[PDB]
């Protein structure tokens, strides 16, 4: 075991470079986990892999706990690890080793009050698989008193939750004929459902500059076939929902938009959100401003551990981490070095701020 | 074709409806709807969109002469999906 | 030339089973610079030979890998790459050691990089057996760990279950193709599990592997195809397993292909004793293992009837994994142990 | 009432190669429905019609599928040509007519099956019966025994597939390797079966197709081989042998069934012999070269079983497959006498 | 800093035939990222890196895809061999280096594009730019003009597909019909273009493939034809002609682009001429036989546009495609002088 180092000595950029170097696509996080556990042990954590091989390092003492829930796995492939002009390139730099590195460093820097624990987790199998990491935590651990999810929100952004998701299927069957008028074929019928639904979504969210407060549709697949007697067509559509539009609402519109076809629907994700007024949000808004930032409340579009531990534990929860999420899963995924340390300072205060709330009780 | 599904029940509707003694103030509407079997029921949907809800409805589907259908079972379409890393193992 | 360097180049040339020529070419080019007479045989096997004489020591490894590429990189002492463990690692060790080994007179040193070992064909190995006469010693190029030696591998059979179901109206009673194929898998899985109860080592177990299960519908007929790999212990012959599998299918169609039965070598055999002794001579504590998968060892073992073991650096548990890797030091560690082992086996052979 | 001959041309006129039996099955059931059978297709697409009442069942198991090839359906001086005239719509039509003609005791029900896929290796038509039906008390297989013939058995069947790859560069071609494999297999079987009297007891390999191709960088070749087995050589044994001759290539094997034979002195045999003999015939007991669904339902069910029907089996799968119309009338009446007893 | 030559072999060593540009694009972007470009692939997979700041943009539009065929990557006495050495990784590498070397005014940003699918008919790499990007103020197309050459234009392109069916019985074969169609098309173009000096002004059909097959009952034949058009003959006109020669078969047509040419006295031309001339060269203005993405982005954007790069276009698509390494250094410096002005 390495000698104890200063939590202030190691920078997040330093830790991230080492962490981004080790390959860890989902299912193969073991060398990355071992390495990080060693690093955390050197920073004052008590670090060791749990039952599912998640990297877990703890600080503090007491009946109260702040969990920082990140993931150590990535999509496969190697983004050529390089640092050029104050920008770090590497797989997982944004999704989500950057936020994970920030968790480790800020957690070791943060001043804790008595009666407060701090558990930092580098979960496995979140990216390509069914999150064996987080599900193991739920099945084996008590619900902590606060959860910060390690996902890129930007250093000056704070994520309160995620948009709802709905998978739509429109299907239509029509008898064959020779006609070439409108709605003559099943494919035309399926295509026009897309247009009229696409039109509605634009109607609903007119003028809304907050993209996560819009309902945005997607035609993932359209197919058609015929047996000479009948023609059939199917349109598969994804709907990403703002908080003010429930699935069953959106599903009712789609259903009402279809006449000659039938619409079926799966709710992939119910919408989920920690309220703006909540203490944990107050802490992070305060933390960002305390370090010279103009904080933005936002929602994640894509799924994450927030989709699981949120509904499970029901505790106050936010997502925070440096990096531009648009760079997730990209061949040149990168993050500026400044944003890393800035987010580290902010999270340091936020952990202190949350621990202060919890200790006041 | 359709002896059971559902021209038989439809034929029964037509005949029994014309035989049935009606009391005053009661109408009797018999409907041979279209596009129910292979399509999205343009027939019934048109009735809903154009007509007042009647006071009682008998659906022309085979229940057997000595059977009466009160409704239908719920249906659920499930999709299970799983992704696992490749390996050489042959265990469970 | 270092083993880690050759491997670093070797693992940079994609060679999935059936597309080995580029890697085979490059390797033949490298072996000549080390003293070999290198040439791809009629099958495409990279073959390097040196010396001459009545006798021959074949280092039989394989150049092909399973598909899916692991981005090639060295990090913290460890080399990442497809086939780095299975089995370009052992092959690189084979090459370096064989040209580094002090060769007695009257001994041939053949190094083979076989094609299509990772598949049902073993086209490269079967070609060797069909065209070449038996060597006096064979070392199998598979990962055993640099401090381990492999005594044997399970046999294997490839099964394909096909079934087709039409359309009456019975959406309730008479049922689907996917269900019939899943029914077959359950039966086979159950049977193998019942046979294998209590047995601690996989090598002495019979284990099936449902590699694929796909159903389809054209509107007329539904169809389902399962692709299954059966791993065989010594106590269960390919003929018997196939007979069992065939009997389990109720309405479907079972199709079978035999790779090889299980094969193992006694630890009391001299070649084993040498390799155990070889590992201690470099600070090692030798371990003997019997493995889960199958090898070309299961082919050349019986066909040539010569002494044989498997040796190679690396963690065989990393076989076919998305981040297959091996520590660079184990390479030269196994290279030294192998260089020794070759020089000594050659003596016993020359001895008689 | 309809004769077997008018029934036969109608069935023969409806093409039903393996995989495409639905219209034939569909039409046959209404012919069975018109004749009074409770008749519909089952879960596998078999044409099924059943007679009588009770817990005791005789099954007339024929098959409605044929091998491909268009044989012009025509009558030339009392001789009906057509694919399936002999193999095996003739016997199947005979089943439909004699099956209705006969009178049964109470508790005894008769069932006629026009199975699908008998001609091909799947035999899934019969396999669906094994999976979804109780074993009948007796079975008559619908294959051409001749109007005065009684088939007691058929050879087993295993299909073999050899595939070999060779690089398109320098050093035996894929074709040569495949051919030599065939040479080895053909020789092994010939040396095994040397001097054996009848086909039933010999092991005979059949090279149905050999095709070599050029992948681009590889030479490829495949050989489709059917293998017909005697009782002495099991499918299991025959596959082990086939495997041992593979050498550079691989052999893929699919078992149909082992050989099967009905014991010569069975009561069900006597019933047919009498039916033949009493109808002025000189019966010859036959064992056939090909295979049948008898080889599956036999070992499965275990009930008394024989094969009977009009037609000369040598005409099976031929470009001008045909049967004399006279043979149809006798076979129907003989099967009836047989059925009763 | 890295020279164009060290950049070229690295790119040439990474195979990128049309459809398989991802690893090449991926690698090129990090080379652009290491060099200081803000660089990632875009929505279509194009390799994109952009320089400078502001609302004014110069685009260096090259392509990273190549035709198939393995040309052994090697240097033989200052001569680099490899697929793409001329067409068109050479020009693309030149873009990456000269694009960074040059110094720009404020408000002027430079963007380097390694487009996908330029070599094939889709040209979707360039089409994605037209769909997703604002029109730049000028464009340089990355094609081999020669270090002392300036390409002002390329011919248009239309791909033609002739398919004909004939019964495999009695009465011209599918092959004969297809061949005679080619004869008609070839003659029409030759009689049109008779005595014309340069390839740019001629219409030239290209029989890339003709293949006849036997369906079984039908004889089949298909002919893949590329057609290169001068300004005088539009794609529309050329298709009408092609249609009129079909007779017994059908012609399927897919338009790439009409011909395009940059007017000889443009300021952007003068800039390159000077860059050539001032660097001790004797420039020859060229119009090329093949086509380019210039033919798409030209009529789309309308900004000043030329094609420039190292390499002799006659070596395009050849088994030993190569470029002198000396040509790379000059072309980089010349492009730079050109870029500045
Ligand atoms: Cl005999
Ligand atoms: Cl001219």
Q: 3-state SS string over chain D?
A: CCCHHHHHHHHHCCCCECCCCHHHHHHHHHHHHHHCCEEEECCCCCEEEECCCCCEEEEEEEECCECCCCCCCEECCCEEECCCCCCCHHHHHHHHHHHHHCCCCCCEEEEEEEECCCCCCCCHHHHHHHHHCCCCCEEEEECCCCCCEEEEEECEEEEEEEEEEEECCCCCCHHHHHHHHHHHHHHHHHHHCCCCCCHHHCCEEEEEEEEEEECCCEEEEEEEEEEEECCCCCHHHHHHHHHHCCCCCEEEEEEEECCEECCCCCHHHHHHHHHHHHCCCCCEEEEECCCCCHHHHHHHHCCCEEECCCCCHHHCCCCCCEEEHHHHHHHHHHHHHHHHC
Instruction: Tell me the chain B residues in contact with residue C207 when contact means C-beta distances shorter than 8 Å.
Output: 90-91
Mapping DSSP to helix (H, G, I), strand (E, B) and coil, where does residue A172 land? strand
Taking an 8 Å cut-off on Cβ atoms, the answer to whether A23 and C323 are in contact is yes
**CATH for C2-30+32-153+262-352, among 3.30.930.10, 3.40.50.150, 3.40.630.10, 3.30.465.10?**
3.40.630.10
Taking an 8 Å cut-off on Cβ atoms, the answer to whether C320 and B91 are in contact is no
Residue C123 is encoded by which pair of tokens? 């086209």
- The domain segmentation of chain E, as residue ranges, is 1-154+258-341, 155-257
Mapping DSSP to helix (H, G, I), strand (E, B) and coil, where does residue A160 land? strand
Query: Chain E within 8 Å of A82 (Cβ-Cβ)?
Result: yes
Residue A242: which of A211, A219, A218, A198 has the closest Cα? Answer: A211
Size of interface B-C (CB pairs under 8 A): 30
> Residues D21, D57, D65, D119: which is the catalytic one?
D65
* Axis crossing angle, helix D235-244 with helix C238-248, rounded to the nearest 10: 140
* Axis crossing angle, helix C123-131 with helix C297-304, rounded to the nearest 10: 10
Among the partner-chain residues A27, A175, A266, the one whose CB lies closest to the CB of B85 is: A27
Chains touching chain E through at least 3 C-beta pairs below 8 angstroms are: A
Q: How far apart are the C-alpha atoms of D166 and C131, rounded to whole Å? A: 14
Q: Can you name the CATH fold of A163-269?
A: Alpha-Beta Plaits (3.30.70)
Taking an 8 Å cut-off on Cβ atoms, the answer to whether B85 and C321 are in contact is yes
Residue A317: which of A302, A304, A328 has the closest Cα? Answer: A304
Q: Where would I find the H helices in A110-165?
A: 132-140
Residue C134 is encoded by which pair of tokens? 């038996």
Taking an 8 Å cut-off on Cβ atoms, the answer to whether A21 and C322 are in contact is no
Residue A51: which of A98, A112, A121, A1 has the closest Cα? Answer: A121
Residue E88, preceding bond cis, omega within 30 degrees?
yes
Q: How far apart are the C-alpha atoms of A168 and A264, rounded to whole Å? A: 6
Full DSSP string of A16-46: HHHHHHS--BTT--HHHHHHHHHHHHHTT-E
Q: How far apart are the C-alpha atoms of C299 and C117, rounded to whole Å? A: 11
Strand partners, D209: D224
End-to-end CA distance of chain A: give it in Å, rounded: 37
Size of interface A-E (CB pairs under 8 A): 24
Ligand approaching nearest to the C-alpha of E201: 2
Among the partner-chain residues D22, D131, D235, the one whose CB lies closest to the CB of C251 is: D131
Strand partners, D110: D58
Q: What is the DSSP letter of C197?
A: T
Active site members of E: 65, 118
Contact D65, D119 (CB under 8 A): yes
Size of interface C-D (CB pairs under 8 A): 89
Residue A109: which of A2, A1, A12, A3 has the closest Cα? Answer: A12
Q: What is the DSSP letter of E203?
A: -
Query: Chain C within 8 Å of B38 (Cβ-Cβ)?
Result: no
User: Look-up: residue for tokens 């203005």?
Assistant: E285
Residue D340 is encoded by which pair of tokens? 């009763």
Residue E330 is encoded by which pair of tokens? 């000059």
Task: Let me know if chains C and A touch, i.e. at least 3 Cβ pairs under 8 angstroms.
Answer: yes
Share of chain E residues as helix, strand and coil, in percent rounded to the nearest 5: 35, 30, 35
Residue A212 is encoded by which pair of tokens? 């996560």
Comparing alpha-carbon positions, the chain E residue that sits nearest to A90 is E30
CA angle in degrees (0–180, nearest 5) for C233-C294-C62: 165
- CA of C57: how far to CAs of B38, B64, C277, C300, D267, in Å? 72, 82, 19, 13, 69
Q: From the CA of E285, how far away is ligand 2's center (Å)?
A: 14
Ligand approaching nearest to the C-alpha of D200: 1
CB atoms within 10 A of CB D339: 22
CB atoms within 10 A of CB A69: 29
Taking an 8 Å cut-off on Cβ atoms, the answer to whether C320 and B87 are in contact is yes
Q: Name the A residues in 16-35 with CB < 8 Å from any C CB.
A: 21-25, 27-28, 31, 35
Q: From the CA of D229, how far away is ligand 1's center (Å)?
A: 14
Among the partner-chain residues B39, B77, B82, the one whose CB lies closest to the CB of A174 is: B39
Residue D158 is encoded by which pair of tokens? 């295993």
Residue E267 is encoded by which pair of tokens? 């300021």
Query: Chain B within 8 Å of C292 (Cβ-Cβ)?
Result: yes
Residue E214 is encoded by which pair of tokens? 């036997």
Query: Chain C within 8 Å of B88 (Cβ-Cβ)?
Result: yes
Contact E120, E41 (CB under 8 A): no
- CA of E262: how far to CAs of A4, A112, E115, E270, E306, in Å? 69, 70, 21, 12, 7
Contact E305, E294 (CB under 8 A): yes
Q: How far apart are the C-alpha atoms of A302 and A300, rounded to whole Å? A: 6
Among the partner-chain residues C73, C219, C323, the one whose CB lies closest to the CB of A28 is: C323
Query: How many residues are given for chain B?
Result: 92
Sheet strands (E) in C171-305: 207-217, 222-232, 253-260, 263-264, 287-291
Residue E338 is encoded by which pair of tokens? 């050109």
Query: Chain E within 8 Å of A330 (Cβ-Cβ)?
Result: yes
Contact D149, D283 (CB under 8 A): yes
**CATH for D155-257, among 3.40.190.10, 3.40.50.1000, 3.90.226.10, 3.30.70.360?**
3.30.70.360
Among the partner-chain residues A175, A262, A266, the one whose CB lies closest to the CB of B40 is: A262
* CATH numeric code, C154-261: 3.30.70.360
Contact D304, D150 (CB under 8 A): no
Strand partners, A95: none
How many helices and strands, by DSSP H and E, does chain E display?
9, 16
- CA of C180: how far to CAs of C186, C207, D123, in Å? 10, 21, 16
- The radius of gyration computed from the CA coordinates of chain B, to the nearest angstrom, equals 22
> Residues C20, C86, C116, C117: which is the catalytic one?
C117
Taking an 8 Å cut-off on Cβ atoms, the answer to whether C322 and B86 are in contact is yes
Query: Chain A within 8 Å of C75 (Cβ-Cβ)?
Result: yes
Distance from CA of B23 to the nearest CA of A (A): 38
Contact E203, E228 (CB under 8 A): yes
Residue D122: which of C253, C335, C100 has the closest Cα? Answer: C253
Q: Where would I find the H helices in E112-245?
A: 124-132, 174-192, 235-244
Q: From the CA of E227, how far away is ligand 2's center (Å)?
A: 18
Write out the H or E segment, with its range, that includes residue E162: strand E156-167
Ligand approaching nearest to the C-alpha of D231: 1
Q: How far apart are the C-alpha atoms of E169 and E215, rounded to whole Å? A: 12
Residue B60, preceding bond cis, omega within 30 degrees?
no
Q: From the CA of D36, how far away is ligand 2's center (Å)?
A: 88
Q: How far apart are the C-alpha atoms of D18 and D69, rounded to whole Å? A: 11
Full DSSP string of E83-109: TTTTTTHHHHHHHHHHHHHS---TTEE
Query: Chain B within 8 Å of A129 (Cβ-Cβ)?
Result: yes
Torsion of CA D101, D105, D106, D110, to 10 degrees: -50
Contact C59, C311 (CB under 8 A): no
Q: How far apart are the C-alpha atoms of C20 and C25, rounded to whole Å? A: 9
Q: How far apart are the C-alpha atoms of A262 and A195, rounded to whole Å? A: 16
CA angle in degrees (0–180, nearest 5) for C286-C287-C288: 130
Mutation site for B-interface testing, chosen from A129, A227, A265 by largest number of B Cβ within 10 Å: A129
Contact E243, E251 (CB under 8 A): yes
Mapping DSSP to helix (H, G, I), strand (E, B) and coil, where does residue A152 land? coil
Write out the H or E segment, with its range, that includes residue C301: helix C297-304
Q: How far apart are the C-alpha atoms of A73 and A20, rounded to whole Å? A: 10
Q: What is the DSSP letter of C16?
A: B
Q: How far apart are the C-alpha atoms of D119 and D124, rounded to whole Å? A: 10
Taking an 8 Å cut-off on Cβ atoms, the answer to whether D248 and C120 are in contact is no
Taking an 8 Å cut-off on Cβ atoms, the answer to whether E36 and A85 are in contact is yes
End-to-end CA distance of chain C: give it in Å, rounded: 33
Q: From the CA of D198, how far away is ligand 1's center (Å)?
A: 5
Q: What is the DSSP letter of A178?
A: S
Mapping DSSP to helix (H, G, I), strand (E, B) and coil, where does residue C70 land? coil
- CA of C67: how far to CAs of B45, C112, C320, in Å? 54, 21, 9
Q: How far apart are the C-alpha atoms of C157 and C120, rounded to whole Å? A: 8
CA angle in degrees (0–180, nearest 5) for E145-E147-E149: 45
Residue A122: which of A35, A42, A63 has the closest Cα? Answer: A35
In this structure, CATH architecture of domain E1-154+258-341: 3-Layer(aba) Sandwich (3.40)
Phi, psi (degrees; rounded to nearest 5) at D84: 105, -5
Phi, psi (degrees; rounded to nearest 5) at C308: -165, 140
Taking an 8 Å cut-off on Cβ atoms, the answer to whether C42 and D166 are in contact is yes
Instruction: Tell me the chain A residues in contact with residue E25 when contact means C-beta distances shorter than 8 Å.
Output: 331
Query: Chain A within 8 Å of E41 (Cβ-Cβ)?
Result: yes
A78 noted as active-site residue: no
**Which experimental approach was used here?**
X-ray
- The radius of gyration computed from the CA coordinates of chain A, to the nearest angstrom, equals 23
Query: Chain B within 8 Å of C68 (Cβ-Cβ)?
Result: yes
Q: Please state whether beta strands E38-41 and E47-50 pair in parallel, antiparallel, or not at all (unpaired).
A: antiparallel
Q: How far apart are the C-alpha atoms of B49 and B54, rounded to whole Å? A: 13
Q: From the CA of D200, how far away is ligand 1's center (Å)?
A: 8
Mutation site for E-interface testing, chosen from A80, A91, A331, A334 by largest number of E Cβ within 10 Å: A331
* Axis crossing angle, helix E124-132 with helix E294-301, rounded to the nearest 10: 20
Phi, psi (degrees; rounded to nearest 5) at D104: -110, 155
CB atoms within 10 A of CB E195: 5
A143: left (phi over 0), alpha (psi -120 to 50) or beta: beta
Comparing alpha-carbon positions, the chain D residue that sits nearest to C173 is D43
Contact C84, C314 (CB under 8 A): yes
Q: How far apart are the C-alpha atoms of C280 and C337, rounded to whole Å? A: 9
Comparing alpha-carbon positions, the chain E residue that sits nearest to A87 is E33
Is A2-162+270-361 in CATH node 3.30.413.10?
no
Q: What is the DSSP letter of A287?
A: H
Mutation site for A-interface testing, chosen from E29, E45, E100 by largest number of A Cβ within 10 Å: E29
Query: Chain C within 8 Å of A267 (Cβ-Cβ)?
Result: no
Distance from CA of D180 to the nearest CA of C (A): 13
Taking an 8 Å cut-off on Cβ atoms, the answer to whether B89 and C292 are in contact is yes
User: Look-up: residue for tokens 């008390």?
Assistant: D137
CA angle in degrees (0–180, nearest 5) for C191-C193-C198: 135
Q: How far apart are the C-alpha atoms of A231 and A190, rounded to whole Å? A: 11
Ligand approaching nearest to the C-alpha of D195: 1
């Amino acid at each position: 075991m390495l000698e104890s180092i200063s939590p202030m000595s190691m920078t997040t950029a330093d830790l991230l470079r080492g962490l981004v170097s080790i390959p860890s696509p989902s299912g193969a996080e073991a060398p990355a986990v071992e390495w990080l556990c060693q690093q955390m042990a050197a920073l004052g954590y008590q670090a060791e892999p749990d039952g599912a091989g998640n990297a877990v390092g703890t600080r503090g003492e007491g009946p109260r706990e702040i969990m920082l829930l990140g993931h150590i796995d990535t999509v496969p492939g190697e983004v050529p690890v390089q640092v050029v002009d104050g920008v770090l390139y590497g797989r997982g730099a944004v999704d989500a080793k950057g936020p994970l590195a920030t968790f480790v460093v800020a957690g070791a820097r943060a001043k804790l009050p008595p009666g407060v624990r701090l558990t930092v987790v580098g979960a496995v199998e979140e990216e390509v698989m069914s999150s064996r990491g987080a599900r193991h935590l739920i099945a084996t651990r008590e619900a902590p008193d606060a959860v910060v999810i390690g996902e890129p929100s930007g250093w000056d952004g704070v994520v309160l939750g995620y948009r709802g998701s709905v998978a739509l299927e429109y299907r239509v069957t029509v008898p064959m004929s020779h006609s070439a008028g409108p709605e003559a074929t099943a494919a035309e019928l399926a295509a026009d459902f897309w247009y009229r639904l696409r039109t509605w979504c634009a109607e609903w969210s007119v003028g809304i500059d907050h993209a996560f407060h819009r309902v945005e549709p997607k035609l993932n697949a359209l197919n058609s076939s015929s047996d000479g007697l009948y023609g059939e067509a199917v349109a598969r559509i994804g709907l990403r929902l703002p908080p003010a539009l429930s699935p069953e609402e959106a599903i009712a519109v789609a259903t009402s938009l279809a006449s000659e076809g039938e619409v079926t629907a799966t709710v992939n994700a119910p919408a989920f959100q920690t309220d703006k007024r909540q203490p944990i949000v107050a802490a992070f808004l305060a933390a960002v401003r305390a370090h010279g930032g103009t904080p933005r409340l936002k929602l994640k579009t894509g799924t994450s551990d927030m989709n699981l531990v949120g509904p499970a534990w029901g505790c106050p929860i936010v997502a925070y981490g440096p990096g531009d999420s648009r760079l997730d899963h990209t061949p040149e995924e990168h993050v500026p070095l400044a944003d890393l340390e800035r987010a580290t300072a902010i999270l340091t205060t936020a952990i202190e701020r949350v621990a202060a709330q919890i200790h006041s009780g």
